[PDB]
Amino acid sequence: NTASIAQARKLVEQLKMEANIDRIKVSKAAADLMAYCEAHAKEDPLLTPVPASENPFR
Amino acid sequence: HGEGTFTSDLSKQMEEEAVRLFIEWLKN
Amino acid sequence: TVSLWETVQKWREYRRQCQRSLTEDPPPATDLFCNRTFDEYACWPDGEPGSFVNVSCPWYLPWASSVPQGHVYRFCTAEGLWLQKDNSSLPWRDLSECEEQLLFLYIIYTVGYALSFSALVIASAILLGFRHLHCTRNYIHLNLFASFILRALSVFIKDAALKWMYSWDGLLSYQDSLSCRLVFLLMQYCVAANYYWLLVEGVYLYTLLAFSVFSEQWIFRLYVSIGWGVPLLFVVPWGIVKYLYEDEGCWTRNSNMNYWLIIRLPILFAIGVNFLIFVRVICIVVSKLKANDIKCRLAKSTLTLIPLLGTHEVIFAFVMDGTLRFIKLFTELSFTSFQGLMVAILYCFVNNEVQLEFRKSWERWR
Amino acid sequence: TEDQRNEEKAQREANKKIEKQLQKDKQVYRATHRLLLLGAGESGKNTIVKSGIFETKFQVDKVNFHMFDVGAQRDERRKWIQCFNDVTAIIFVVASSSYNMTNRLQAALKLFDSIWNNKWLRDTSVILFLNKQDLLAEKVLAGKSKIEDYFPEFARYTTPEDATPEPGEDPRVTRAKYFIRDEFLRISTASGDGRHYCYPHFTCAVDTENIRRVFNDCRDIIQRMHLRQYELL
Amino acid sequence: QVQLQESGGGLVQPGGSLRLSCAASGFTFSNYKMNWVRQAPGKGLEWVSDISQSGASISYTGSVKGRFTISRDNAKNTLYLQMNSLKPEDTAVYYCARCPAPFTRDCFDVTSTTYAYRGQGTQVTVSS
Amino acid sequence: QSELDQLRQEAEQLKNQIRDARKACADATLSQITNNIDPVGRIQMRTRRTLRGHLAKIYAMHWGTDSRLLVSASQDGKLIIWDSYTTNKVHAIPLRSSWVMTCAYAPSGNYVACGGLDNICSIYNLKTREGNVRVSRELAGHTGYLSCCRFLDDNQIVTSSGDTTCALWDIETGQQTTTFTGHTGDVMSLSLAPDTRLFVSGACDASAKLWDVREGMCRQTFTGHESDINAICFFPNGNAFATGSDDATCRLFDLRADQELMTYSHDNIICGITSVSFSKSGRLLLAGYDDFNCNVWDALKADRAGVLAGHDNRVSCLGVTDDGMAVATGSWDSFLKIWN
């Protein structure tokens, strides 16, 4: 043909090997970030203001 | 250079008056 | 040209000539003449017994020039004193023989220097604090602003120090002390290192268009050494000659015009060279507008250039070789006063850079 | 702090030896003008003066230039063109070639238009030549290449208000060189914002001397820059 | 994601007319310019027309002025063309190419290489 | 023909199937769970340094490994290795290709790399023994400018170019070992997962794919933007990434649910985005705009919490130190400012 047949054959197989995957509900991927971001909230220098004494840029 | 001229005018004018001021008191 | 130094000298010289006469010639014992009492006006030697005596006028007073034969005509009595005046012993007292605009020039001369001083404090603090305007073109304009605010302060001293020189004493003697002679070297310098910071504007702005720039480190230290240092070679040599050879009266009088051609002739060269640079630049600003009414544009440029290159003095009589002399200062000494506001407005507040800088910097602070 | 005194005294020479070289190399960078070179098609790559950037250097009366010939790249310019918003000028070359192999003019009017109205290229000034005039003069009097077929307003176009530069200038060529010029300037005089210019030219009819014609008009671009910061202009 | 798909082409004898269309889905259609592009058979792509964001700045090509017409509808997300009299030369495929960025005045979409944001086109044929 | 017609129709059936699964998993948005988390309030932070010495615009920077040193490369053809605490230049490497579009700093503190419009990529031997920093290797083989570099360890780079492909070299011999294809547009950025076994990439045509270092593959393919993509990074947990296009919106995708979770839109913004990065604890999201600002987005219920406005030109790069006390932001006026 005109070489566009071979490019049109790789696209269909790329999607065919992708639709067969396993996913999870959003509520499992939303309460995951809500629990990781308050389990170590104490180690955020920007979020929790730091006393000047230990601050190295002073 | 007006500053070299205006200085002289206020100098000479108020200076020659004091000559009269020196002598007008002299009678008094 | 009777002056202060000989004013008290002609006082002591004239009198001392006849207190010798008082010692040599006491009042006569015949009493036909009058007593020899130094009335502080003339020692008054013995005159005429009952008639008029002809004694020449006091020579120290120059008003004997207009009447070289003038004599102090006074009668005397043969009682040891003069005639009586107002029931008291007074001499024969008949001695008669031997401008509004200038006051107004002072009110403008001292209301422009006062406001051309507050402007260059606001304009010299905004031009530093913002830290986004430290381009070399703004280094030249910090020294120009500092050369005016020193010029105004160099004049405010003169007039006030002149009032104190005229405030009874035999001679206030502040024109014996060096406290007078140094202030009028500080003054002469301060206005001589102000026409060499308008030639630096004419040379920097003209080497940016016609010639190509040659370096930086060399340029900014061949300008501070040509605006602050060339006067030292035309004021100091003039200061020495008015103390080493020829020294009197606080030097506010310059009889030998050769001497006032060593601190003036040089100023003329700075005025000249900065006239050609103003024609050459405006011969270009019209070539770009041609190939782009626009006559109004051309006018709006010329008028801005005259206050920074300061070419207005040459448009007026440059040296003008008298009512014409009074005319020269009515406008010229008023155009020089308000020059602080003219420069400050046109290069600190109507500038586009800064007017954005207050816009930005206010959006980030309340 | 017995030893950190030595180290802080030891690094303060490594900060002065660097800063002394970095200042000797601030004058050289300020004495050279950079010039891009956009060429549409196959007309003009080294004609005026004779992978990656392909620099070339020359000098006229003791002033030096650099010229970038951007070759061996893909033809999608909306990402690497906003890197060149710092050069002095953007030289530009067009030519009235054959459409047999599409449209050699209407594909250049839409490229010059895109450089003009870009949000970042608002302060650079083009210098565009109109190449291949010894080809057009042998085609217009031969009829092979026409502009009425592609451009309608040409047949009802007037006569210019200027004069021929050379003997041997028929109405046919003069209507051709001076119609395209008025088609580029219809764009150059419609941009309200920005501060930049446009300097047309003619070429290829005479021996190229364009090492002068770029020098004479790369001075004009900087003079009008210093005037507008003193606000004198 | 963006989806541009054109429909309306066909076959017509010389002197006839033909009406095209276009469709947008996946963005706010009232933020960008739009264009049309044609490709002669065995030739590179050429420019045909365009229209501004609100519908007040139209342009055309020097070979087509007076015969075509471009117009759009914001509230329904569609864009049309209108051909009136067709020569034998008006035979090519026509695409519906959006402009790269929103709130602009300038576009860079003619390139023969792969360029996203461009439909698949319809075929038009003209002959006796 | 018939097959190209069916292939263009065969794909549509697959694509229409994929959406159904994605819309069968969404049962609540992230903005409905976090309507009870206590809002952060408001935070202020002001410049603490300012590094001067460049002559032209700045396209790159990379914080060191111990959060002490950093690198910055400009268009005047000069690399510089600053020191953050006391403002001392420790090196100044001159280049030969004046157009530099990226740089990177090795994790072992030993190497520096950079490349631009000149297609080659150069790698510099820094902690030498002789005492002169020169070119170690010269990696050629691309066709088009090169717009990002990263290290995996010493002697392994993964790079992105401008001819729609990525590559994975090895410094010891100079020749590739893998090549990733599947992007139909120019590739602008990439970032590495915090275990160094994946890396997501963003390209024009508005797509962001998820590759695999062990063998070239395309596990996932996320979409939903409206224009080309400029900058991207991972959530510190390695289980999400955020990206920013040229339509004034950031988004927070997901690597498990395989869809989009939430978007960052404000009505008064009409300018693009040039850089994105996360905080150390994943509660903030520093974005850099072309309105000369740098907003600060709360990252569990979108609404601003501050601004970082100190620049006059656009922001061309930003980063956050590994431990996290500073945010260096470069700009097109040659000044870096160490916020805090």
Question: In a few lines, what is going on in this structure?
Answer:
The complex is a heterohexamer of chains A (58), B (28), C (366), D (233), E (128) and F (340). With 233 residues, chain D is of the alpha/beta class.
Q: Key terms for this structure?
A:
heterohexamer, B: 28 residues, mainly alpha, 1 helix, 93% helix, C: 366 residues, two-stranded antiparallel sheet, 51% helix
Explain what this protein looks like in three dimensions.
The complex is a heterohexamer of chains A (58), B (28), C (366), D (233), E (128) and F (340). With 58 residues, chain A is mainly alpha-helical. Chain A is 33% helix and 0% strand. The longest helix of chain C is centred in the middle third of the chain and has 29 residues, at 136-164. Chain C has one domain (99-366). Chain C has a two-stranded antiparallel sheet. Chain E has a single domain (3-126), classed as Sandwich (Immunoglobulin-like). In chain E, the strands form 3 sheets. A 4-stranded antiparallel β-sheet of chain E has the order 3-2-6-7, with no helix packed on it. Chain E has a two-stranded parallel sheet with strand order 1-8. With 340 residues, chain F is mainly β. Chain F has one domain (2-339): YVTN repeat-like/Quinoprotein amine dehydrogenase (Methylamine Dehydrogenase, Chain H), CATH 2.130.10.10. At the A-F interface, helix 1 and helix 2 of A face helix 1 of F.
SSE ordering of chain D: HHEEEEHEHHHHH
Side by side, the strands of the main sheet of chain D go 2-3-1-4-5
Alpha carbon gyration radius of chain D: 23 Å
**What number of domains of chain D?**
1
Helical percent range of chain E?
under 10%
Ends distance of chain E: 42 Å
Could you state the CATH homologous superfamily of chain E? Immunoglobulins
Largest interface: A-F, 40 and 57 residues
Oligomer: heterohexamer
Form type of chain D: elongated
What count of helical segments of chain E does DSSP give? 0
Percentage of β-strand residues of chain E: 15-25%
Largest sheet of chain E: 4 strands, antiparallel
**Residues in helices of chain D, as a percent range:** 25-40%
